[PDB]
Symmetry: C2
Subunit: 144 residues, 2 copies
Amino acid sequence: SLANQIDQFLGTIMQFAENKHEILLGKCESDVKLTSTQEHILMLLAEQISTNAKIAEKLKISPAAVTKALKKLQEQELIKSSRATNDERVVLWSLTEKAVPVAKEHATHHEKTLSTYQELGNKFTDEEQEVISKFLSALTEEFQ
Amino acid sequence: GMSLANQIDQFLGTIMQFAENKHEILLGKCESDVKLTSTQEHILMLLAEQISTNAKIAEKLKISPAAVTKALKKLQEQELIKSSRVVLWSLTEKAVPVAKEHATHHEKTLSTYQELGNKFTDEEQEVISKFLSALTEEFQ
Ligand SMILES: [Zn+2]
Ligand SMILES: [Zn+2]
Ligand SMILES: [Zn+2]
Ligand SMILES: [Zn+2]
C-alpha cells in the first residue's frame, strides 16, 4: 500500500541521514576533511560575512554549538574574525584564502544535489510533476 | 525552471528537523506512562511479535549488538522482559501494554499516511509510488 511505501521511504531517509546534519548526494570532493556543518558554515560565510548569531539562526543550532564550530575553523586557519564598522562589540566572521575553494566545493555539492532532484523530477511529465508537488505539500504538513 | 527540485530539498530538510533526535518517524507524542527511548519501546513491540535473540534485534534495527545489549539491560532492570536459554528474550506482563501502545503508535502513523494517500486518485497514487521508488534509488 502507499502508506507502507511512504513509511519505508521515510525510514530510508533516516538510515541515509545518520549521522549527517543534512542530505547531500554523491561524495564531498573537498580535500580538507571537515564535517557537513563545518563546510556549510564556510559556504554561508562566502555568501555573506556574519556573526555567531546570524549563523545560529541559519543552521538552526545553539549559539554554543556555533561557538564551538567557529573556534575549530579559526584554529584550522579557515576563518578569521574582525569587528563591525560602527558597533565594535559585534564580531564578524569571514573566510580565509584557504577556505575559498572549500566553500566553493560545498556550494557545488548543493548544486549537484539539487540537479539530481531536478533530473529525477524531469523524468515525469509536467502534469506528473504537479501531482508529485501536491503529494509533498500534503506530506509536508504532517511534520509541522 | 520549476519548484519541484527545491521542493524535494526543503522536504527532506523537514524530515531531518522532525527526526532530530529520534530513532524513527512516528506522528504524535508517545502515550505510554513509562518514558522509554523509542528504540526501547520498538524493542518491546518486536518481542511481542516474536521472542528473539540479541543478534536478530540488531539486524532488524540495523544497530550494533552492543547497543542492543545496552537497551535490553535497561528493559530488564525495569522488569519489562525476561531471558531464557543462544539467549532468548521475551516480554513480562508489565510490558504487554507498553508494546501495545507502541504497536498502536505505528498504526496511527500508518493510517495518517493512508488518508493522505487516499486524497489521490488510483493512477495518481501510482505516480507517487513511482516517484518515491525513484527517490529511494537516490539514497542507496
Ligand atoms: Zn564538501
Ligand atoms: Zn550544506
Ligand atoms: Zn509509545
Ligand atoms: Zn517503533
